[PDB]
Structure formats: C-alpha cells, structure tokens
Design a protein around this nucleic acid. Structure first.
Ligand SMILES: OC[C@H]1O[C@@](CO)(O[C@H]2O[C@H](CO)[C@@H](O)[C@H](O)[C@H]2O)[C@@H](O)[C@@H]1O
Ligand SMILES: OC[C@H]1O[C@@](CO)(O[C@H]2O[C@H](CO)[C@@H](O)[C@H](O)[C@H]2O)[C@@H](O)[C@@H]1O
Ligand SMILES: OC[C@H]1O[C@@](CO)(O[C@H]2O[C@H](CO)[C@@H](O)[C@H](O)[C@H]2O)[C@@H](O)[C@@H]1O
Ligand SMILES: [Mg+2]
Length: 580
DNA sequence: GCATGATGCTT
DNA sequence: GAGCATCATGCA
C-alpha cells in the first residue's frame, strides 16, 4: 500500500515546476540553526525525495526555492524559511501554508502536524509525525526508506488538501485572512526570529550574582525564623512550617493541600515575620530561576542573541505566543524585575531600541464593536479610561475619584479586556462575588451599549456556533449550550471576549505587515524584533529615531479605521528598559 | 525519564 | 483568563 516516488540522487528539471507541494523537514522542535533532514517535492510530474546535502548544494534547486514565481504549498513554512535562512538560503513563493489554513478554519483542533490537518478532511494516508519520529528521549530520525516515504506522504497530503482547505476558507470569508494577513505575517515573523535580540550577558550574570547573595541571606533568615531548614520551594514542606509549626490560619486550600500563593501570604504577613521573607524569597527566586538563569540558557554564546519562536497557530484568540525564550512576559511591574530589561540591547553599534504600544486597544475595539455612546465619547475625548469608568460606576466627579476608586475601576476594565468571571473579579479585588456583581451591574448601567453587545454576542454564538473578529477570524464555541454552569459560563465569556481580544490581534498583525512595507519603501534600516500583544519592538540606527517617532505610530494608528481613534505611545533608548 | 500540581510573570 | 516557565514530587 506504499506510495510511489523517486528517491533522487540529483535534482532534475521536472522537480522545478512552477507549482509544487514542498517539504523541507526540520525535526528539532527549535528550528534555529537546526538540521534539515530531508526534502520532498510533489508536483504534476510526480513525487520526489531529495537528500538535503545534494539539493541544497544544487544551484538550480536553490534558485527555484528563491524564485517567487515558483509557487510552493507547505505546512509550517516559517520553520522551513528560518532553517534555510540559517543556511543562507532564501525561500520565496509560498502561496499556501496548510498549518495556517487549518488554524484559521478551527484553532481549537490544535493541529500541529500534517496528519492532524489532513484528518479534518477525512484524509488519513499520512502518519502523525510523533508516530514516525517518536517522542522525548526516544525521538530520532528513522532510516532513509522510512523517512523518505513519510516526507513524500506529507507532501502528497498537502498537494491534495490545498483545494478543499481554500474552498472552506472562502466559504467562511477567510481566504483573504490567510493570503493577505497570516501568510505574509509568517514571513515577517521568520525575519524577526532569525534576526534575534542581542543580550548583555555580562549584565545578566552580574544581576545573577547579586541575586544569589540576596537569596542566601533571605533563605537563612527564613530557616532562622522557622527554627529549622526545609525546602522553601516545596508547598508541602512550607505548608507544614506555616500551618503546623507556626499555626498560621488556613485561608485557602488547594487540591493537594494548603495554598501558599502570594495572595494568601500577603494576608498572613501580620501574623509572623517569616511570611514577608517567604514572599521576598519567592520574588528573588522567580527572577533568578526563570529569567536570569532561563535567558542565559538559551542565549547563543557566539552572537549573544536569543532567537525566540513565535507560535502563530496556537491561540483561539489569534494572539501570537513566544517560546525559547518566551519574551512576552519579561518583568516590568516591579522595578527589581524590570531591571532585567536592561539586558536586552541593540544588535549593532550606535543603534537604539524603539518601542511602540497601543493605548487601550482592547477597550477601544469594544467601544467600536458595541457602538456604546458613552465609551466611544470617552475615547474621542482621549479620557483616562479608568478614571472615567470610576466616575461613572461610583457616580462622582473627576476630582472626587480617589486612588482606590480608580484602582477598582481599572480592575473592572481588566476583567472586560480578558473576559474574567465575576468570581475572578471578586478574587482580583478581594471582595465578595456579590459586591463584584454589583460593580458589573453598575458598569452596564453606565455603558448600556456594552451590555447589549455582551447579551447579543452570546446569543449569536449560540445561533451560529461561533463568534468572529474584525478580520473574520473565527472561534467555535460548542460549550455554549452545555447544561454544566461552569462549562457554559466559560464559553459565554469567550464569546464576549474573543471578538475584542481577537480583533486587537488582527489589528496589530496588520500593523506589522503595513509597517514592514513602509520601512522598505522608506529605505530605513530599522527592523522589527518582537511583538508583545499590543506592543511592537524594533531596533534601528540612532539616526532613524526621529523618522520612526512619526512613522511607527502613524502606521499603527492607521492599520484599521474604527469608530474611535487608535492611539499609540512610543519611546526609545539604549536598552529595552530605557525604551519607556 | 516524564506527567502533573503549585506557583508566578506578562498583557 | 491564557500561555509560558519554574521547581518539587510522584510514578514509572
Ligand atoms: O514551528 C512552530 C510550529 O510547530 C508546532 C507544531 O506543528 O509546534 C512545535 O514547535 C514549537 C516551537 O519550537 C513548540 O513550542 C511546540 O511544542 C512544537 O510541537 C506548531 O504549534 C507551531 O505553530
Ligand atoms: O541546598 C540544597 C538543598 O536545600 C533544600 C532545603 O534543605 O532546598 C533549598 O535549595 C533549593 C535549590 O537551591 C531551593 O529550591 C529550595 O527552595 C531551598 O530551600 C533541599 O531541598 C535541597 O536538597
Ligand atoms: O437572563 C438573561 C441573560 O442570561 C445570560 C447569562 O447571563 O444567558 C442565559 O439566557 C439565555 C436566554 O436568553 C441563554 O441563551 C443562555 O444560554 C443562558 O446562560 C445572558 O446572555 C442573558 O442576557
Ligand atoms: Mg499598552
């Protein structure tokens, strides 16, 4: 039942047709400077397997890869593009990416290989990658015969599935979303990842040493106050010290045992001096283990750069994620952790970091979609939205809004931006679910348009089976009809929140595409380095800062036209820390 | 070795 | 709330 193909010893003309399904296999999860283990090509002339050493050395094949007029259909083209970039080879003409197509059709399926995408259309003549390569320590590239058949079968699947996937995308009015947004963005992400971000390793190592000293000191104080040594990082061992030896009250429990989360510890601080030290230990340990040690582990020793990998096909909101290292959660709230950003520097001499972020894009999107008169007017006046929200829900003038009032209004807005439940709000504000509900009710009284939107979108999700974003991204919500309160409730919150978060995701993605086109037209050397949800980070010659101050915000603010203005703040400096 | 729980960082 | 990590702990 095997599939016929040619195990080529050399590249031939028929292998270079103007349309083909192409597989450039990179098995390592992190594809940066990784091996390409095999190549498969499927076109009108047949199916072929090529050894990388020969194909990638062949002038004709390389030229074919870089020829934009020679169209290729692939799965996870970014992976191939980046691996090739590390080899000095350009990949152009990718007209269809099955990974992104499957992702847009249904992001909940978690499609991570050709077999999974193929199963969506009842095509199963291809094996899952895990079945071929294995997992974990058992992972390995199989003998050529097995490897070759697998790559050819993946190419064959891509060749066959392009049409049915494009047809459904078209039916969903998502064809442009794929071809004009996600695929072009994939190439931009490839460039960003390959460029990488330069790291001041000496700085990190310095901080690391200072942290180690501070950790040792606090660690000893903890054992001193506890009257014995124990594993502080062990909730079980810590729980015994706090709730048994010291008799602190148990305010919250977890499946396993006593909760020792920061939230719980804060409340116990008044009872014993050991508590504040545990909190301080947790903070220092977080910075040391996750950030300092974590970053140093993935920095390339030769260039001192980190090359993250953006997962463009994971979230059901349409936002991008980042891994190895995750550069979307570097500390900023507290000054101590914020200092870590001083370690991210420009990659060239006399260059600077330029960062631009949307100001409240989620709430502005909500104002637009819900057509709430009060919210739209607030943004048209460029009001401090948290202060404004406080004025309305607490019924007071601007000068009557106290700091605590603004903080709680901000939390209410935070809940709307991330679609948290009333229990979530209650927990965040440390108040009763009942009081949190009253805040929500007060908010809806002040923003009736938002209330109407929330009611209507849940109804629409139920009727159609999914909700959509500004650029037609879709999220199916089968749990919307569940008779299990918690399950149904979460689905309703996602129905309300996905159009907001998802539309904001669509906007910044388009902004990235528009920005790169503008940078090219303007002949600027400036280039994108990172995307952190509502923020874009670039680096460029110091001589280009003034031009970027006008160009970047303009492009970002004009990415789309909403019923309210889009506002972008920006700053630049010698390090990411200073770009604020 | 590897799965899962508790924890905490960002937006 | 999600996605990404950590370390500890159990088992396997
Ligand atoms: O290449 C990224 C792309 O690959 C998938 C699998 O198809 O994820 C793999 O690579 C990621 C980055 O190294 C890992 O986080 C993930 O664990 C691994 O399976 C897609 O999800 C992703 O879009
Ligand atoms: O020195 C390591 C040894 O100490 C214990 C406590 O007896 O844990 C300490 O060190 C760990 C690694 O530095 C921390 O994770 C932990 O929080 C700290 O108390 C033992 O578990 C370990 O064998
Ligand atoms: O009381 C109506 C109000 O309830 C919500 C949940 O807060 O939805 C419930 O009632 C709907 C009937 O109109 C059902 O479709 C839905 O499944 C049920 O949870 C709100 O959406 C609605 O405004
Ligand atoms: Mg912002």
């Amino acid at each position: 039942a095997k599939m016929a193909f040619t195990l080529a010893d050399r590249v031939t003309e028929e292998m270079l047709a103007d349309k083909a399904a192409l597989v450039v296999e990179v098995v390592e999860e992190n594809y940066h400077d990784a091996p390409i283990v095999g190549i498969a090509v499927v076109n009108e002339h047949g199916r072929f397997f090529l050894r990388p050493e020969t194909a990638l050395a062949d002038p004709q094949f390389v030229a074919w890869l870089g020829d934009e007029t020679k169209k290729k259909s692939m799965f996870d083209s970014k992976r191939a593009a980046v691996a090739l970039k590390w080899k000095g080879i350009e990949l152009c003409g990718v007209s269809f990416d099955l990974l992104l197509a499957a992702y847009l059709l249904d992001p909940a399926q978690g499609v991570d290989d050709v077999a999974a995408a193929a199963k969506m259309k009842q095509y199963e003549a291809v094996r899952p990658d895990e079945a071929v390569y294995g997992k974990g320590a058992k992972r390995a590239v199989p003998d050529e015969p097995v490897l070759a058949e697998h790559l050819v079968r993946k190419a064959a699947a891509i060749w066959e599935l392009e049409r049915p996937f494009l047809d459904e995308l078209r039916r969903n009015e998502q064809d442009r979303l794929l071809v004009e947004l996600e695929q072009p963005l994939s190439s931009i992400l490839a460039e960003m990842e390959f460029a990488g971000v330069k790291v001041d390793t000496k700085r990190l190592e310095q901080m690391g040493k200072e942290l180690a000293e501070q950790l040792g000191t606090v660690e000893q104080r903890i054992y001193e106050l506890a009257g014995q040594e124990f594993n502080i990082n062990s909730p079980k061992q810590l729980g015994v010290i706090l709730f048994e030896k010291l008799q602190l009250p148990v305010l919250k429990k977890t499946k396993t045992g006593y909760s020792t989360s920061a939230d719980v510890l804060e409340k116990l601080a008044p009872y014993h001096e050991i508590v504040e030290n545990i909190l301080h230990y947790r903070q220092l340990g977080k910075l040391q283990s996750t950030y300092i040690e974590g970053l140093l582990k993935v920095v390339r020793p030769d260039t001192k750069k980190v090359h993250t990998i953006f997962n463009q096909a994971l979230t059901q909101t349409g936002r991008l994620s980042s891994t190895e290292p995750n550069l979307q959660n570097i500390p900023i709230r507290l000054e101590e952790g914020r200092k870590i950003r001083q370690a991210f520097v420009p990659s060239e001499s006399d260059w600077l970091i330029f960062a631009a972020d949307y100001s409240q894009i989620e709430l502005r999107v909500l104002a637009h979609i819900a057509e709430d008169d009060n919210l739209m007017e607030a943004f048209r006046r460029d009001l401090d939205i948290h202060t404004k929200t406080a004025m309305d829900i607490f019924q007071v003038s601007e000068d009557e809004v106290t700091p605590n009032m603004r903080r709680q209004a901000k939390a209410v807005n935070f809940g709307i931006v991330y679609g948290i439940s009333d229990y979530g709000l209650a927990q965040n504000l440390n108040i009763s679910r009942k009081e949190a509900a009253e805040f929500i009710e007060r908010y809806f009284e002040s923003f009736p348009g938002v209330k109407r939107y929330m009611e209507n979108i849940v109804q629409e999700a139920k009727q159609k089976g999914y909700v959509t974003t500004l650029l037609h991204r879709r999220r199916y919500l089968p749990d919307i009809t569940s008779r299990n309160f918690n399950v149904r409730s979460f689905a309703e919150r996602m129905a309300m929140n996905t159009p907001i978060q998802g539309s904001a995701a669509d906007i910044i993605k388009k902004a990235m595409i528009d920005l790169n086109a503008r940078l090219k037209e303007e002949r600027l050397q400036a280039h994108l380095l990172l995307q952190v949800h509502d923020e874009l980070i670039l680096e460029a010659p110091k001589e280009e800062m003034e031009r970027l101050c006008r160009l970047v915000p303009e492009v970002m603010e004009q990415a789309v036209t909403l019923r309210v203005p889009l506002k972008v703040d920006y700053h630049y400096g010698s390090t990411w820390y200073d770009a604020k």
